[PDB]
Structure 1
Amino acid sequence: MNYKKNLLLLYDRPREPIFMGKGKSVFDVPDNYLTDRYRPIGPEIQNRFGELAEERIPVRSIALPDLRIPMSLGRQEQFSLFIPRHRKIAARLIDIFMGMRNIEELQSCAVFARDRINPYLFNYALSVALLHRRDTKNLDLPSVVEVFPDKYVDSRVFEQIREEATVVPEGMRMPIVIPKDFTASDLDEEHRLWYFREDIGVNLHHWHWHLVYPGDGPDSVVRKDRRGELFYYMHSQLIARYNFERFCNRLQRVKRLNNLREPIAEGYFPKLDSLVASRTWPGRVDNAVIKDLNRELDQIKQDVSDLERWIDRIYEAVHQGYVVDESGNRIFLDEEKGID
């Protein structure tokens, strides 16, 4: 349908306001849908882009769900599916997008939200919705690489592209070669696994898994057959494949982190720049040590001991051969369901 096709426009140019041209189309955004910055000049600003497109897409203003929690994350912050607060925030947004009565009310909601929500979050939530809703199966979503190259690409190329696109006419622009083996030199023996660690496909795979088996969200999207066993097996095959690569690079099988209190020998500096946060990613020095965490905005307060304690409780359950639920009953780790 045209409606389905229109949702895909929400992926095009994440930080460009939704009233700007997306492909051959424009969204006719209602006055009350504009963000605070643009609303006061709204009618002047909507027209400039609105006389370029072939198509025109009407959006009905409707009453929308409460987006305060999804909006609590800053637009120029980073989004982490590991940080509990953010998972809650993502869970909420998936809830909202899942629960729109139909595809027209989804369009309307997403068009309101997009310019008010952190783009990475928006992109995650929407994608999870669209994969799991009944009325939006099919619908070939764009790869997150084409939508956010900044999570895949040496920062150095963005100004190279910007120059190429400004100076050179469309028919004459030559493709940009993406640097490889660029995050470290020969002094780091680890550089050699660039072809694995930094492969677009390997990294895309990791993202995709997290879209299909999200850990928090409506039951509909979370409960999948043997998802706990898959978590195990998927992470397991990575290690095995990774070791395989290590043997082809004159290296040893990857050592576990013995101890959370000993220095971590392998530094890593990603050389990525998040255009969304308008801030580079921090790296980690050779031989850094994990530190107790107290980040109020993130809502993480956690000593290394808390982590060590969980580890001991799990090992105890695995050795007992059972775990204890909150009611206090025992769930046996049998040979079908134990792994799960």
Structure 2
Amino acid sequence: TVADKQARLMPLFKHLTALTREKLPLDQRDERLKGVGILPRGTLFSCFHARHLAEATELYVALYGAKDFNDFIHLCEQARQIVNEGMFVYAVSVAVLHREDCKGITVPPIQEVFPDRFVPAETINRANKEASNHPDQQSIVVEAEETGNILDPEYKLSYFREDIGINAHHWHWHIVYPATWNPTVMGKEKDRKGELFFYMHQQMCARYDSERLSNGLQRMIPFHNFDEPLEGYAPHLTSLVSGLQYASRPEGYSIHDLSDVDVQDMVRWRERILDAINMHYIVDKDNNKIPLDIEHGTDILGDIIESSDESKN
């Protein structure tokens, strides 16, 4: 039944961190699996980076490809052993969302699956400590609120920024509209995904601005210049997988090139986009021009800007 199906899915989601240790004599048998497994388990998975996204896409496809739900569970069970866990959650969630066979099925809570992302280093540590401190069946309760000196006014916004629901939503939205989404492979297409990308993010900003004003703060200003130094932020999140945590960002240094990408790469792309707007057309790979139609324009721009697989160039 559906209920049974739900039960099977929940365990795909359990003890992801632990699920590592491949226990696989050979991947060769898993021909389907050959494509994935580049990213190491412990490593952090990036939703944004292209290479990471590529692996993720490869994983989803296998899941989509799965002939039946049972087959789906099997490959998933096996894949989860090798692949980086973050990528795994990402690929599986996408599969659950789209794949018909999964006409059954919620995904386990993101907050619940990775509590460490939702709550601070202290209350993670506390609940772990209490667990060890006195063994007992008894329940442990920890109040995350803390006691601290409130130095930055940005702190006021924390109710909005830190909110569990907001973070969860953002995770889910990207799952429904993956950047990697290839309509040919799935066959189905996500209507107006580029435009939606634009709208959803715009709303988040708009909503954010309302908070600042409620706060008595001015509206947020854009990252209009790349040269400017960034404000620092320390998340105080320790990623349970690892002993490592998300690195905090101290105050103020201009932007640094990464091996993967340059800054004048970045800037150039921005001018291209802003130019093509002005010209009212964008150039496809074919070197044909497509007009930024009133109907189509936002969608086309969304794909290019994000950018999705859908980007015309």
* TM-score, length-scaled by structure 2: 0.87
Q: Assess if the C-alpha contact under 8 Å between 2:121 and 2:238 holds in 1.
A: yes
Residue by residue over 1:92-130, the C-alpha shift from the partner in whole angstroms, topping out at 9 and shown as x without a partner, is 000111111111111111121212121111111011001
Matched, 1:84 2:50: yes
Instruction: Give the secondary-structure state (helix, strand or coil) at the position aligned to 1:67.
Output: helix
Q: How far apart are residue 63 of structure 1 and its match?
A: 5.3
What's the offset of the Cα at 1:164? Answer: 2.8
Is 1:256–2:256 an aligned residue pair? no
Q: Distance in 1 between matches of 2:210 and 2:20?
A: 46
Contact 2:20–2:41 (CA under 8 A) maintained in structure 1: no
| Aligned with residue 136 of structure 2, among 153, 169, 179 | 169
Give 1:34 deviation, angstroms: 2.8
After superposition, the Cα gap between the structure-2 partners of 1:181 and 1:234, relative to the gap in structure 1 and judged at 3 Å, is farther
CA contact (8 A) 1:157 1:178 kept: yes
Amino acid at match of 2:18: E
| 1:336 lines up with 2:259 in the alignment | no
Q: Which runs of 5+ in 1 are unaligned?
A: 20-32, 40-61, 295-299
Range with bigger deviation, 99-108 or 10-19: 10-19
The CA deviation at 1:272 is 0.7
Distance 2:142 2:187 in 1: 38
Between the aligned partners of 1:260 and 1:99, the Cα distance in structure 2 is: 42
Equivalent in the alignment of 2:266: 307
**Identity rate of aligned residues, in percent?**
38
Match of 1:187 among 151, 154, 161: 151
Answer whether contact 1:77 1:276 (CA < 8 A) is retained: no
Q: Give 1:70's match in structure 2, choosing from 19, 25, 36.
A: 36
- Structure 1 or 2, whichever has the larger Rg, is 1
User: Going by fraction, where is helix more abundant, 1 or 2?
Assistant: 2
**8 Å Cα contact 1:212-1:221 kept in structure 2:** no
Q: Which runs of 5+ in 2 are unaligned?
A: 300-313
Counterpart amino acid of 2:14? D
- Give how far 1:320 is off: 0.8
Q: Distance in 1 between matches of 2:297 and 2:82?
A: 43
Give the superposition deviation at 1:141.
1.2
| SS at 1:323 equivalent | strand
Tell me, in whole angstroms, the C-alpha distance in 1 between the residues paired with 2:147 and 2:78: 41
Report the more deviating stretch, 9-18 or 247-256.
Answer: 9-18
Deviation at 1:335, TM superposition (A): 1.4
* Equivalent residue, structure 1, for 2:10: 8
**Aligned counterpart for 1:34 among listed residues 1, 20, 23:** 23
* Structure 1 pair 222–118 and aligned structure 2 pair: CA distance change class (3 A): farther
SS in 1 for 2:105: coil
Q: Which amino acid aligns with 2:80?
A: R
Structure 2 residue 257 is matched with structure 1 residue 292: yes
Offset from partner CA, 1:232-259 (integer Å, 9 cap, x none)? 1111111111010001112110011121
1:91-240 matched pairs, under 5 angstroms: 91-166=57-132, 167-170=134-137, 172-179=138-145, 185-219=149-183, 220=186, 223-240=189-206
The CA deviation at 1:18 is: 8.5
Contact 2:229 2:254 in 1 (8 A): yes
2 CA distance for matches of 1:225 and 1:271?
38
